[PDB]
């Protein structure tokens with residue numbers, strides 16, 4: 007196994023002629039009238055001027071945006087997913103029918119699974135288990151296969167999202183790992199194509215480039231091509247808090263290492279990353295990322311992700327030094343398609359406490375309902391006798407309780423039923439196995455509004471003795487609320 | 496108010512020179528290095544050859560795909576949302592700071608909300624109350640405002656009439672009316688069809704398009720019939736829609752289908768059915784199947800309507816021989832359908848997906864007639880909501896049928912629907928219950944599997960046993976559980 011953070015052996019140095027390069031170099035391509043396949047849609051991404059957000063924050067300059075979400079897969083990684091493969095295919099490293107294994111979650115695995123789906127490669131994406139249903143559904147739809155690795159297990163560990171991919175690589179015939187962190191094809195893709203597009207579209211003239219930093223291939227290749235052909239251009243790198251990628255190290259000091267923004271920042275310094283071509287670094291957080299993302303979507307009509315928001319949130323700061331007549335280009339990595347249920351959802355933004363909006367009987371208290379005396383069950387009775395009673399009284403449940411009255415959980419009918427479809431339970435065995443812990447608990451002193459929210463969300467909430475959370479005062483559903491309302495109106 | 500199905504007054508006739516046209520005509524545009532705004536990204540969509548699926552089903556011809564999901568909003572409607580506005584803006588009909596009300600829940604609301612967001616118009620989208628979260632979240636994110644309308648085409652309180660009520664009540668408000676507006680088919684007549692002719696060098700022998708409002712297929716078929724006579728135009732209509740001709744094809748039991756964006760109960764103004772050489776009937780199964788097949792094999796990320804288009808294409812293009820060309824229209828992206836046809840769980844829940852891995856419980860192929868269900872308790876449409884709440888209190892169910900005096904069941908009522916409506920303030924305890932009638936509901940019959948029933952009761956809280964149109968009763972989970980665990 008080789009470490010991705012292993013120091014770079016590249017001898018490239020500013021001033022060295024391009025004739026000395028040992029690598030293979032491609033060029034931006036004239037696109038056909040009719041595309042032979044969807045993969046030809048990758049590249050030649052549009053440059054869109056930012057008209058509102060630039061001026062709103064007082065930028066005297068021109069602010070352009072390089073939109074990589076118009077790539078066939080809806081991310082910048084479609085550039086490298088193509089390149090890394092097209093190189094391997096040339097090298098003789100990659101054969102027809104082979105397997106491509108990658109230790110990635112969502113941003114590269116999509117591009118790779120797409121290219122693999124088009125060209126008939128088996129694709130194996132290895133990642134933690136709780137991966138967002140958007141990315142996971144896209145991958146499964148493209149034909150890729152997923153390996154769930156444990157949520158808590160280290161990078162250096164033998165059971166992680168990465169090491170296990172290497173174990174599969176060794177164990178599975180014809181399997182290859184392109185290794186986006188170590189592969190020179192990653193930054194060479196942007197060095198050869200992206201940076202040339204940016205230079206063509208800007209007529210060779212721009213005074214700043216702002217990019218968010220992930221593996222680092224993008225910002226590296228771009229900054230190198232620019233430093234060569236456009237010296238005056240300053241390169242600005244963006245790093246989330248909790249990441250050590252940014253320089254100097256003093257900026258990297260923080261309490262938590264966890265952030266909600268996807269695609270940028272992780273704990274190690276990849277091989278492909280060149281931090282000597284980055285003129286200045288900026289620290290962003292999740293709040294301004296998502297805020298500026300919503301602002302981009304709303305004001306500019308640009309459908310993009312949170313990393314784009316980070317990039318721009320930094321841009322409005324870094325471009326203040328720029329005056330009138332100059333130009334600043336930002337990199338917008340991906341689309342909103344992956345974040346449909348995350349930063350795009352107001353409920354989610356509220357839950358994490360980012361925007362946190364404010365909130366005739368709405369402020370009336372649940373107490374006014376005057377509910378029934380609960381039917382609770384022992385963990386220990388059969389599922390048959392269980393749904394026998396729940397059929398008798400037309401109630402759907404239990405707080406599942408111990409002998410002391412302590413709540414051990416809850417159980418509902420539908421849960422039982424799906425547990426039966428899976429065949430993991432049968433009427434004989436104890437109900438204590440089917441305990442449903444994923445419901446929500448709210449109680450007497452709570453507002454009827456929050457309850458209402460849960461009632462359009464779920465089937466029920468659970469009134470607990472106010473100051474004893476292990477105690478059950480009663481069970482609330484929509485029918486008793488409708489009872490209250492229809493009663494006093 | 497004007498009806499969308501009102502007959503077309505257009506005097507356009509095949510053979511008439513283009514110099515006689517009273518309308519305004521644009522042309523496909525050379526795009527800049529740097530786009531001044533995102534709206535310039537609309538158009539010049541790529542044409543991608545279909546290499547696998549064509550040959551797999553035995554097509555001797557070339558099958559190309561016009562991908563409209565690469566538009567800035569991720570749908571074909573971005574073309575018209577632009578046009579309808581750009582015309583109004585020119586006409587003096589549309590002023591800066593105005594309000595654009597549209598009663599569509601379709602992609603048009605997205606395109607319009609985007610253009611409105613970019614150009615600073617207030618946007619009001621009026622639609623039903625279910626409305627799968629993707630579209631709704633996109634709209635709210637773009638700055639648009641939503642009105643929930645608890646669906647009926649010519650009703651006074653619907654997704655459309657109330658938009659006209661707002662149009663009258665709100666200053667500077669306009670309704671572009673995608674069904675009646677000539678800008679809709681003119682957008683495709685002027686641009687899309689010219690793109691298709693440029694990319695195909697003026698030669699193609701068939702075009703297959705799914706039919707929604709009909710502006711697309713109309714404008715395209717007209718431009719083609721003019722400049723490429725040999726090209727046959729093939730229209731696609733879901734089952735439950737009457738758009739297809741002849742009328743004999745439109746015969747079906749249910750009028751409800753899961754595919755979004757195509758087929759209607761009415762014939763829109765902009766639709767010209769005299770330029771369509773042949774029509775084909777598609778269903779939801781082959782739509783979603785071919786959509787998954789497009790994504791998997793061709794790497795094309797698209798929607799279910801695309802699947803319908805292609806599912807028809809592999810049939811219609813069989814007449815084509817080697818050397819010819821067939822072009823299909825792919826309307827939208829998978830972005831709206833992330834939790835619907837893209838989800839395996841959902842595909843299973845609706846019964847489209849294939850069942851076995853080769854073993855499962857014995858009651859699976861038993862049927863619900865064995866459950867021994869009792870008589871349903873029916874509610875009148877004229878009853879008061881509070882009364883419903885009383886009866887349904889005492890009996891203790893979460894749902895009841897809404898049926899008129901003549902015996903025909905107009906629908907179902909669920910507590911979540913009543914609560915949802917009340918929280919919006921669109922219903923009161925003294926109101927008609929006929930307001931909260933819930934017309935989208937799932938049917939399992941007497942003779943259908945206990946398995947299908949199970950999948951149903953994983954989607955939703957009920958389904959409804961019917962002896963043949965007639966009924967039997969209402970089924971929920973606890974009867975299944977009671978039967979099995981017995």
Ligand code: HEM
Nearest residue numbers: 013014015016017018022026027028190193194197227278
């Ligand atoms: C005149 C220009 C360049 C020269 C002469 C050059 C030369 C080299 C050399 C000698 C190596 C060592 C390979 C090894 O030790 O196994 C290397 C590696 C590498 N180069 Fe370059 N290079 C040039 C430009 C670039 C550019 C423009 C990029 C990216 C945009 C790049 C990315 C890399 C990467 C990622 C490695 C791998 C380092 C490692 O595996 O540790 N190089 N290069």
Ligand code: HEM
Nearest residue numbers: 502503504505506507511512515516677680681684714765
């Ligand atoms: C030589 C070519 C054409 C001529 C002379 C023509 C003429 C007309 C005329 C006289 C009307 C009646 C306006 C009214 O009564 O309000 C009309 C309406 C209309 N035209 Fe055309 N037209 C031509 C081509 C087209 C094309 C190519 C399209 C679309 C692709 C189109 C779409 C419409 C629509 C949607 C209406 C509205 C009909 C209604 O509101 O009931 N026309 N046209």
Ligand SMILES: C[S@@+](CC[C@H](N)C(=O)[O-])C[C@H]1O[C@@H](n2cnc3c(N)ncnc32)[C@H](O)[C@@H]1O
Nearest residue numbers: 378379380381400401402403481482483486891
């Ligand atoms: C008869 S049930 C009807 C079906 C409804 N979906 C439900 O499960 O509550 C509705 C009434 O029973 C009450 N209820 C539900 N679960 C209960 C439980 N485990 N113990 C006592 N009352 C319960 C509710 O609060 C409501 O007043």
Ligand SMILES: C[S@@+](CC[C@H](N)C(=O)[O-])C[C@H]1O[C@@H](n2cnc3c(N)ncnc32)[C@H](O)[C@@H]1O
Nearest residue numbers: 400870871872891892893894895969970971974
């Ligand atoms: C008592 S309810 C308990 C709550 C459950 N969620 C429900 O609505 O069915 C369950 C029993 O009532 C039946 N049921 C539900 N709605 C019905 C109605 N409208 N007419 C007759 N039986 C009904 C079910 O089929 C089942 O046998």
Ligand SMILES: *Cc1c(COP(=O)(O)O)cnc(C)c1O
Nearest residue numbers: 707708709710711712756800826
């Ligand atoms: C509107 C629509 C169509 C049909 O396009 P028309 O312009 O009505 O002919 C097809 N698919 C989707 C998803 C649509 O929204």
